[PDB]
Amino acid sequence: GETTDGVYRVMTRRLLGSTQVGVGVMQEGVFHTMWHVTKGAALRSGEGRLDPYWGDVKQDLVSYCGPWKLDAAWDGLSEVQLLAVPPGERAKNIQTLPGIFKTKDGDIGAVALDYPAGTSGSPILDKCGRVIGLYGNGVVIKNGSYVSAITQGKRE
Amino acid sequence: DMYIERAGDITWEKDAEVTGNSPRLDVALDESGDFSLVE
Numbered sequence: 001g002e003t004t005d006g007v008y009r010v011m012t013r014r015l016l017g018s019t020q021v022g023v024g025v026m027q028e029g030v031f032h033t034m035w036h037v038t039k040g041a042a043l044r045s046g047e048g049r050l051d052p053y054w055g056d057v058k059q060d061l062v063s064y065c066g067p068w069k070l071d072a073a074w075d076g077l078s079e080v081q082l083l084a085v086p087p088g089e090r091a092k093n094i095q096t097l098p099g100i101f102k103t104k105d106g107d108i109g110a111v112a113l114d115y116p117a118g119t120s121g122s123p124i125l126d127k128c129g130r131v132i133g134l135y136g137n138g139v140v141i142k143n144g145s146y147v148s149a150i151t152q153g154k155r156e
Numbered sequence: 157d158m159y160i161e162r163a164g165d166i167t168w169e170k171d172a173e174v175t176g177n178s179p180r181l182d183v184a185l186d187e188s189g190d191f192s193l194v195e
C-alpha cells in the first residue's frame with residue numbers, strides 16, 4: 001500500500017456506505033493516528049496491510065509499521081494550523097492560537113475548533129509544516145462547543 | 157475492516173481562514189484517556 005508522506009482519511013464499510021471514522025499522518029513509513037479511531041485494529045492501503053506497532057489508550061495515540069515519528073512541539077506562543085480533514089469534504093487549513101489544558105501533570109496545547117468526530121486524527125502544524133500533534137481528544141465546555149488537546153507522542 | 161485514502165500534503169498554507177479562541181481550561185485526564193473540566 002501507499003507509503004507516501006502526507007495526511008490520510010481512515011474509512012470503514014462495516015456501517016452503511018463508506019464512513020470516515022477518523023484521519024492520520026503518514027511520515028517516514030509510519031502511519032500515526034488516535035487510538036479511539038482504529039481501536040488498535042489493522043488497516044488496509046491498496047491491498048497492503050498496516051499492522052499496529054505501538055499504542056496507548058491514555059495518550060490516545062497509535063502508530064502503524066514502526067515507532068512514533070512526530071517529535072515537534074507547540075512553542076507556547078505562535079499561532080498554529082489545524083490541517084482539518086472532515087468527512088466528505090476536502091482538506092481545509094484553519095489557523096488558530098491554541099489555548100491551554102492545565103492538568104495536575106502539566107499544561108498542554110489546546111485548539112478550540114468544532115468539527116465532526118470523524119475529523120479525529122487530523123494534524124496540527126507549526127510555521128514550518130511540522131506536525132505538533134493530533135486533533136480530536138478533549139472536552140465539551142460551558143458553551144456546549146468542543147476544545148481538543150494538541151496530542152503529541154514521544155519519539156525514541 | 158478499515159482502510160486509508162491520501163487526503164493531501166501536510167504544508168503550512170499562508171492566508172488560511174483564521175478563527176477560534178484560546179481558552180485556559182482546568183482539565184483532568186482519566187485512565188481511559190478521557191479529559192474532563194476540573195472545577
Ligand SMILES: O=C(Nc1cccc2cccnc12)C1CCNCC1
Pocket residue numbers: 036060114115116117119120135136137138139146148189190191
Ligand atoms: O472529544 C472526543 N472526540 C471528538 C473529536 C473531535 C471532535 C469532536 C466533536 C464533538 C465531540 N467529540 C469530538 C474524544 C473521543 C475519545 N476520547 C474522549 C473524547
